Design a protein around this ligand. Structure first.
Ligand code: HEM
Ligand code: HEM
Ligand SMILES: NNC(=O)c1ccncc1
Ligand SMILES: NNC(=O)c1ccncc1
Ligand SMILES: NNC(=O)c1ccncc1
Ligand SMILES: NNC(=O)c1ccncc1
Ligand SMILES: [Cl-]
Ligand SMILES: [Cl-]
Ligand code: NA
Ligand code: NA
Lengths: 713, 713
């Protein structure tokens, strides 16, 4: 069947905004996963998972009699798709169970691991999500094998369809770099927002870069990709050596024995894939990656034997039975147990990427410290495993259950507890009138609140106005935030706050985070009044102010908005057209196409553009909240043409006289071009729509102001 | 960006069930278009439209000073995508304004037409849909030019994204037959459900079949495609000759001067396309189809000149200025006016497809009668135009406004008005107890009600249980309906009804349509009781019984369910896999994927399969409403393989013993294979889900029973 994507492969795709509707969700619209989870008997779940670890099923027999290694790799892969650049990927939505992740080559035979867990999922039903179960299972594995975890939080609600994520442009699984859709350019520079070296891998190629078995060069790829997953050198060494303390790889025969991935298999495979014609197809004959390595002498128990081996032997390049490059210990005795035959033993083996931990000079120092002090190793691995598996969960307010750790970690962008009474509606009214009396304009108040709140991204639930981090490094100096204007606004609001707080009793006070948002609300109310409309913008207090010491400046860098179509901003010239970047930002904000449209049209006429650009400001009453953007955009009396200076800027001229009326960007004009967006613009540009436009704008403004407010969930 | 449809281009696409969510719709979920329309001043809209007819805009000047012909073509195209095979296409959702129809080659320059209507649309806002406006505009064009219409109904609610319709598999616009994705096989047999001869055309090629200018051969294509749009020979002649009484074609220069269609044009084109480099690009220089034909001596007035010309001259094959085949009248004077220059006249011209009306022997007889009796032509064209433009609107209950014709037409599948008191809840309880005391089984009650109600399709709103057409020809004889079983059920119900109605006073009675549905509800209640659940199923009375003379047997043929996965039925072996047909049927039923899933799993255990097939009947308590389908389907204790006898039937065997436990079709096993469907099955196969399953099943049952109940809207 030929589709619109086939005929117009470069048109903008809006379906990405319209996923996760109540149509596709089988749970009631009233279902609240947090409340279901809070009544789960988590201890009972963990006992069943503990019993599972050593209950081998004949359709996928457990190596060494223990599924622990399999499940730790399963949880690691669930979390390991995360990219700091956009927050997309991670374990938080249980997306391993859907396309394309369920069928990535690097996920081969994790379909078996998930199926092992069905009986437990079936038993507990809606009170534990797949997403939470995958993580919990990896924790129980580690515990059952003698490793003390740092903690676990529930609260990952299941999703019911695949996410639309850019995983790369290659058309061939595992394609080596330098092809027509190369994710690499220059000196091995990986394109943003990607965090893997090849399409269908998690981080790196276990044989080495593009299959070249050089541990030194492999270390560069490890460092790059792990950094793009928010992990530093210590964390990376802890994780890889920690994971590879357990279990084994599977490469018993040639890879050409392995059939179709789950999404391509026949109907009879019932959602499983990679069916293998090599010998029994499973167990001792398993083929997963094509590598055949077993790292330690006790693969089913926590130990420090990974480093004892890595440092205690010299390593020789060899090939598995499938032909993959891997390494074996020179001169060693057969000390590693076999997974099925207790009368066979093997020499120690390693992957190229394991040897990176010894042959890269910065890794080596950490690996040596962890070898000499395995208690330091254990603690670093526990902390890193917690971070790995929770990095996309969002604020601590979303963490559920009895195993949540009490230690607050810097990477959580923590927000202090509120320890005083909050402002009420009459105080809010009083503050809004003081803000308006100070002389701050609609444009300044709207712009500042939009800057503070619009750092939120629903992908990993980081960012938003809670914390008042806009006043801190590095937000206060971002070019999109207009640092000089911002500093002057913030100083006026801080003086209002100090005067309000100093006049109170009872210990009531207002945070600056709350006041920035409330001042934005006042701005919107005043804009509506300027157009002849009386509205109240809803406001919910309770935000708190974070300190600079509770804010990791480097980790905050990925939230910098380099493209923000809502403020008509583009920090430089990109390969991706600006309208595509708009839709991308809208998806991170959790906005539908109607919400995006109304929000943008309102922000234009309120003066939210960076630098006070007149691009898209299609009104003669700036700072009044009207539907003028839409009415003027859609006026066929105006003709539009790209400028000589810039193909990305357009002049709108009177068709009859040639007089210049307006200028706009691709982000402004896409609303009069794209057939679905123009149909939305028409609704808000109609003669009956001014009241609807105001009401819808206020509702979307309030939604953005509240995006991080999980303390009110 | 590589997507899941790139990697797995044959996987089933569920997004078609999850279109038209409240996420993409800008109107509130409380918006009710019928109520808005009811307040429209329709008379005022018609005055504005009359004014527009001769208000020429310089960017697309009106031929002859009058846009009437352009608008008639616009409305005809809006309606003309309709296919009786699936009811998809038609004017009823205003889809001409979205991709791909906004950019079909046959819709060239109708983007100009729609843009001329923007000021009117803007003025009246939500109180007139685009969908209604396009048709109303065609009506007003006809009236402005002297032709009295049969009437008009409002009520086509706008839609807000493109529909997912199969328009064909060709990858080239207008591709000629016999390519790699040919829509034709055998002796020029057009594949179902298509109703056009080439990708991007409405019905046929105006130059003749595959561009060969043979009017007799063209007539065969006209007849076949018009029949696939629900039109007979008389209606077809009346429509083509009536349309081509007005206006002209556009082919002033070579087609290579015409640029990108709207979905491919640059953003500065603001939603318009086909910009032409030929002279001024417009008006006298316009290029639309490439043909250059003006049919009558008065193109802006209703006349009898079409047939006078067709019969009064002999025709010679010639070429337009763009190179297209067309016909000119031999020996004629220059009697046809020019559209822009009062000192130019032209000879009569015709399309190949106009000459079909004279040289096909069956059309010739009609054309002659219309020539000799122009009042019969007029009346035929008025009735046909009404039909063309309302064929997809559904029951008369959905027709709004003051110009609805009072005459009831056969093609509307009319249902008599109810003129007596309806049954109340006490009566309903009494009838259900009688049905249950008669000996009818769960399986019979469920199957008969399902058969009655599941003929509905939302694409054109035909079908459903209202009218009790299941008792009439041809529904009573469909193999999917099990004619012998059905006849025995219906005779028992008719005896129940006759005894109930004979005992009443005050004129109360129950229709057979209502009793079929009510008996189906009793069967569901009984099934729930069989499983230990106390469930009352909602029922709404008010259906009426249509007669045989109100039921066109030929028009009913397209509702015959040749694939109904809900009853595990397939009438023959088709090239489209059966799970694709299941999703297609779900879409016509208006079901989401969770609704499809719950409905199918329950029907399987209630005994709704055709012929009492055991395929997918994964329970040992048939006729009890349980979630057994899901629990057994997902049991990993069973392994599945296609049978040797048949690749489309599967055997499920105990993994450990090899013993056969179940059989299933592709439709059954898809629920355990497709990763999204299996995630839904898991929710209903969980240990906490038995009550959920029963309740969701009842809700979806009721939804299907009420699909055609526009009398209660
Ligand atoms: C440079 C990063 C990494 C590379 C290239 C990598 C590579 C692989 C490969 C190729 C396999 C074999 C798959 C198979 O044949 O069954 C595997 C197994 C495994 N990996 Fe990793 N790994 C990495 C990091 C991690 C991390 C961070 C963890 C967890 C903390 C992890 C835990 C495991 C475990 C437990 C297994 C054994 C699975 C089993 O017993 O079935 N790995 N690794
Ligand atoms: C066999 C069926 C038909 C064929 C092949 C066909 C073909 C066409 C073609 C090629 C054009 C020229 C487009 C252009 O260059 O501007 C056209 C114009 C037109 N057709 Fe048809 N036609 C069909 C049936 C209909 C029907 C059923 C109606 C309406 C009842 C209709 C009404 C019109 C009108 C009014 C125009 C003139 C447009 C103008 O003045 O801009 N046609 N037809
Ligand atoms: N822990 N990572 C893996 O299992 C893997 C990595 C690369 N190819 C196959 C499997
Ligand atoms: N691909 N996923 C995201 O963009 C996203 C997910 C959940 N909420 C907002 C954005
Ligand atoms: N009325 N049908 C059309 O205008 C058409 C058919 C084929 N090519 C262009 C236009
Ligand atoms: N393609 N459009 C349809 O199939 C449809 C439209 C409205 N309700 C059900 C189905
Ligand atoms: Cl994601
Ligand atoms: Cl459609
Ligand atoms: Na994420
Ligand atoms: Na339709």
């Amino acid at each position: 069947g030929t589709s619109n994507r086939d005929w117009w492969p470069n048109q903008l795709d809006l379906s990405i905004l319209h996923r996760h509707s109540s149509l596709s969700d089988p749970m009631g619209k009233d279902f609240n996963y947090a409340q279901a989870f809070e009544k789960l008997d988590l201890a009972a779940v963990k006992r069943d998972l503990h019993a599972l670890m050593t209950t081998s099923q004949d359709w996928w027999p457990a190596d060494f009699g223990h599924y622990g290694g399999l499940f730790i790799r399963m949880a690691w892969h669930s979390a390991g798709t995360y990219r700091t650049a956009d927050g997309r990927g991670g374990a938080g939505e249980g997306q391993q169970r859907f396309a394309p992740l369920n069928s990535w080559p690097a996920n081969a035979n994790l379909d078996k691991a998930r199926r092992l867990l069905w009986p437990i999922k079936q038993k507990y039903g809606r009170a534990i999500s797949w997403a939470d179960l995958l993580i919990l299972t990896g924790n129980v594995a580690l515990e059952s094998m003698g490793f003390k975890t740092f903690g676990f939080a529930g609260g990952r609600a299941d999703t019911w369809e695949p996410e639309d994520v850019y995983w790369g442009s290659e058309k061939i699984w595992l394609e080596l770099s330098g092809g027509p859709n190369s994710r690499y350019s220059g000196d091995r520079q990986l394109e943003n927002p990607l965090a893997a070296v090849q399409m269908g891998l998690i981080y790196v190629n276990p044989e080495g870069p593009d299959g070249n078995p050089d541990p030194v060069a492999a270390a560069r790829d490890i460092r790059d990709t792990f950094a793009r997953m928010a992990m530093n050198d210590e964390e990376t060494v802890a994780l890889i050596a920690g994971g590879h303390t357990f279990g084994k790889t599977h490469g018993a025969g040639p890879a050409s024995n392995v059939g179709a991935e789950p999404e391509a298999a026949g109907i009879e495979a019932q959602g499983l894939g990679w069916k293998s014609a090599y010998r029994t197809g499973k167990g001792a004959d398993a083929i997963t990656s094509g590598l055949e390595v077993t790292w330690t002498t006790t693969p089913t128990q926590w130990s420090h034997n990974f480093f004892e081996n890595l440092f205690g032997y010299e390593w020789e390049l060899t090939k598995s039975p499938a032909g993959a490059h891997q390494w074996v210990a020179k001169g060693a005795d057969a000390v590693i147990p076999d997974a099925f035959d207790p009368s066979k033993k093997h020499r120690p083996t390693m992957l190229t990427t394991d040897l990176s931990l010894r042959f890269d000079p910065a890794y080596e120092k950490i690996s040596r410290r962890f070898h000499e002090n395995p208690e330091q190793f254990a603690d670093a691995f526990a902390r890193a495993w917690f971070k790995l598996t929770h990095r996309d969960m969002g604020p601590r307010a979303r963490y559920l259950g009895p195993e949540v750790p009490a230690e607050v970690l810097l990477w959580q962008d923590p927000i202090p507890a509120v320890d005083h009474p909050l402002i009420d509606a009459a105080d809010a009214a009083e503050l809004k009138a003081k803000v308006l009396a100070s002389g701050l304009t609609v444009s300044q108040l709207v712009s500042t609140a939009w800057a503070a709140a619009s750092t939120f991204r629903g992908s990993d639930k980081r960012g938003g106005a809670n914390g008042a981090r806009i006043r801190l490094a590095p937000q206060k100096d971002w070019e999109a935030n207009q640092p000089e204007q911002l500093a002057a606004v913030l100083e006026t609001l801080e003086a209002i706050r100090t005067a309000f707080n100093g006049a109170q009793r009872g210990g009531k006070q207002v945070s600056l985070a709350d006041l920035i948002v409330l001042a934005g609300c006042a701005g919107v109310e005043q804009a509506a009044k300027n157009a002849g409309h009386a509205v109240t913008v809803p406001f919910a207090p309770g935000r708190a102010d974070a300190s600079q010491e509770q804010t990791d400046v480097e980790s905050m860098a990925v939230l910098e908005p380099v493209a923000d179509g809502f403020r008509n901003y583009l920090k430089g010239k990109y390969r991706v057209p600006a309208e595509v970047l708009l839709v991308d930002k809208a998806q991170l904000l959790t906005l539908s196409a109607p919400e995006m449209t109304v929000l943008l049209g309102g922000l234009r006429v309120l003066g939210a553009n960076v630098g006070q650009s007149r691009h898209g400001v299609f009104t003669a009453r700036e700072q009044a909240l009207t539907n003028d953007f839409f009415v003027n955009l859609l006026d066929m009396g105006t003709e539009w043409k790209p400028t000589a200076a810039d193909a990305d800027v357009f002049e709108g001229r009177d068709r009859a006289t040639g007089e210049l009326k307006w200028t706009g960007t691709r982000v402004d004009l896409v609303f009069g071009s794209h057939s679905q967006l123009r149909a939305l613009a028409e609704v808000y540009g109609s003669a009956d729509a001014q009241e609807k436009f105001v009401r819808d704008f206020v509702a979307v403004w309030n939604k953005v102001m509240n995006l991080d407010r999980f303390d009110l969930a």
